[model samples]
Target: STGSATTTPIDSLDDAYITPVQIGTPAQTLNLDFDTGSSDLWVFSSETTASEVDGQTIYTPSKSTTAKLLSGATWSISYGDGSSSSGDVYTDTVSVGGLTVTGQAVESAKKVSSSFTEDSTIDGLLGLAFSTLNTVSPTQQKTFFDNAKASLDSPVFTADLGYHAPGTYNFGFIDTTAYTGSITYTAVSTKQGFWEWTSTGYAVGSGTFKSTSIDGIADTGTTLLYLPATVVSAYWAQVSGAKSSSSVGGYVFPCSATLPSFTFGVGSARIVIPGDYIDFGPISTGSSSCFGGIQSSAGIGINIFGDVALKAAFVVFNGATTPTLGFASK
Candidate 1:
């Protein structure tokens, strides 16, 4: 699941762009970064010889008949933190939730980064955040969305997640059973690979940081809500002048009092991160510290509001029928 890639070509090149696709069941499912900035479906494979494959879950070819090996195409990926992976291409039947996509192109990693490979909980990553950053070469390969547009029961894709649990990732037709209002659509900004946004202000505890502006992409690839220094400091001001402790890379804070509710006003929507997301347990620092939901990511040049903030709402990537990305309430 963590270090592999799979795909199947459904139609002739001419009609291929419009064919409806079925999902294939993965041998096993792993927690993925689910990035919108990149378009590549990779997983950890047991066949990998890389030193980083230690504890990660690798896909089992024996689990699916359609899994095919791509003899010539191989890939190597690297992140900002020097996280990297190398793999071979293969075709497999891939499934997300209940929908089955047959003939899906997947890349099976032969090696992954040391941090990624050694982690016991992180298994693999899925990049469904968008259709643009897809590894499917527009000139040669067709993306899953380009092919599945015809068969979907509805033209929407929905992501429902919970507290660090598997099976929360679901695909196919958009089921608006849990949303509160119609999805707010925004035109895709092709300037960068990630989804960028502008915020009106942010609220921490009872302190309202007004006119506060943020310009960055929303990424599931990142683990925390990375913010700039100004926002980070303003947030700390709310918790009894709580200061950041270097124990957790200087990103964590040790404040015992009740942290205030934080809300991020992004134009039409207001996203709130409850206190629990930040408050953890007491550490050796003698101060009750929490993994401050918002952290400093200075060099990245972009603020990535990861799953911690995403889980609170419904995100709709309206790529199939519309050119806009939409967000709604849970």
Candidate 2:
């Protein structure tokens, strides 16, 4: 068993980056969105009393023939958008990357809102991101990274985006298969765990987006790629048949047409966003329009490069390597 990590539950707060894990048996691998934004690793169970979650996978522990739940504890979580899900807490064994950890925390949602529960494809979330936002009592606070750091050969965990698939998130040691040589490491600042920039600007599609110019933190907790309004407008202008939509708060573009690929150069490392990611909307409004990488965050103070942005590059949240405030990616 991979030994348990240290955790003491605390008040709900929005900070810290967490890693994701794949749960279930060898036949059924579920890629969970590890969220430090909330605590609790939950999956939609076969016995879920609530309505279905669309676009996300749900897991049924009973199918495993070895599932277990904790005694008399309930778990609940609500996002800032007001969407929430609730379930009962249980303890069970879980594995990631061939490592097994026993007595792991799990939550089974009995009630989920229509917004998320209806659209979710996978069972539920495995919050490997952090423990601040978890809603379980006695503050169930341990995340996957806290547990996996010790077992990894390098003592370093790397998240590579875009290499696999847009939503294809990875965890554990940095994969050198797609990179040049040794990976670069950076220190993170103290206080919150959001990776602060070492410098201010990034070059996107041969165009520069300044550090002082852009707002929002690099958040692992969020799941969407949000950008400044002006930036969004500029990016959309390059594509044909792009129309403005306030319903979703961004530029809605035709998914059928060909679009140019975008490249973001952070310092010396350059990350590319394939054209298909834009053409193939992960969240499609209809047959003609689909959700693209750029979303309007005009009034929103923080730009969360959730899975969309994180999946496009190799990111490292190295709190152990520094004062805990820096992030470097390839």
Candidate 3:
């Protein structure tokens, strides 16, 4: 079934967003973080083998008659950071925004990292990335999008992420009212299991546009934007009293400084991030200096265009036979 749902930002600074998802026949509702960067539909479950429970809503497979544990199958995932989780596999009816997928692989967590346990705002992550990225062992599993594409009206899901407010994620179709002008589509490199694409170029404020290939993934899971060091430095250079700081960590500028707008190319289209969008927040609660949302990703070996850039535009994650990404001004 085709449907729409709103994703609520859980933090005061729009840190992570969660969409209400339904699992199993009786429909146990849980707030799951929608991640386009990773493909593992793992959750806090009744079978969690550890005592690392806080405010998270746990999914009890035994309660749902429709839930069937996949014998001998398990999943283990490690993030770029130290966070990782291992779990047993179960097949169940999973639905989001009214789009239901039967026989969906739902990983019931046996062990989770403290980074995940401490944050109770989200019960788990429902990945929209390629099934190739799914961490299931022996027999790999399909992602939610991959499993639901046949029944979906348009075989795609779109993300309209917002700032300090609830955003929308729609499946089967795109809401024309959510965007303006026309959408600019780009080629996606799916072999790597990410919605990866190369950006045409970037410009700082109203300055000159440098036509360079900035390859990165459109990741909703990550909170900030990460780009080449050159581009990161160029953006921060426009603001007065801005410099890289180890104490504050990353680039920090005076709160009083007027940060210039940031624009990145999408085909021939340009998605603009308002001057204030890059001012993440004060380095410290009461500090007069704020950290930049766009940081250097040189150390990661790969660039990532995360929420900082995504919230600036209406994004379409086309799960067509040959996946592609579309971006439009909101």
> Model 2 compared with the native: what TM-score?
0.72
Candidate 2 lDDT tens digits, 145-244: 5565655554444454442333223334445564454444433433443454433334445566544434344555565557666666767787888877
Best candidate, lDDT: 3
Any runs in candidate 3 off by more than 4 Å, and if so which? none
**Which of the predicted structures, 2 or 3, would earn the higher TM-score when compared with the native?**
3
Candidate 2 C-alpha error for residue 63, in Å: 7.9
Sort by TM-score, top down from the best: 3, 1, 2
lDDT of each: 0.57, 0.54, 0.91
For model 2, the superposed segments whose C-alpha errors exceed 4 Å read 1-31, 35-38, 50-72, 80-82, 162-172, 181-199, 208-223, 240-243, 254-265, 280-290, 319-330
lDDT of 3 by residue, 47-93 (tens): 77657878899899999989998999999998765688898999999
By lDDT: ranked, best first: 3, 1, 2
Output candidate 3 Cα RMSD. Answer: 1.2
Model 3 lDDT on a 0 to 1 scale: 0.91
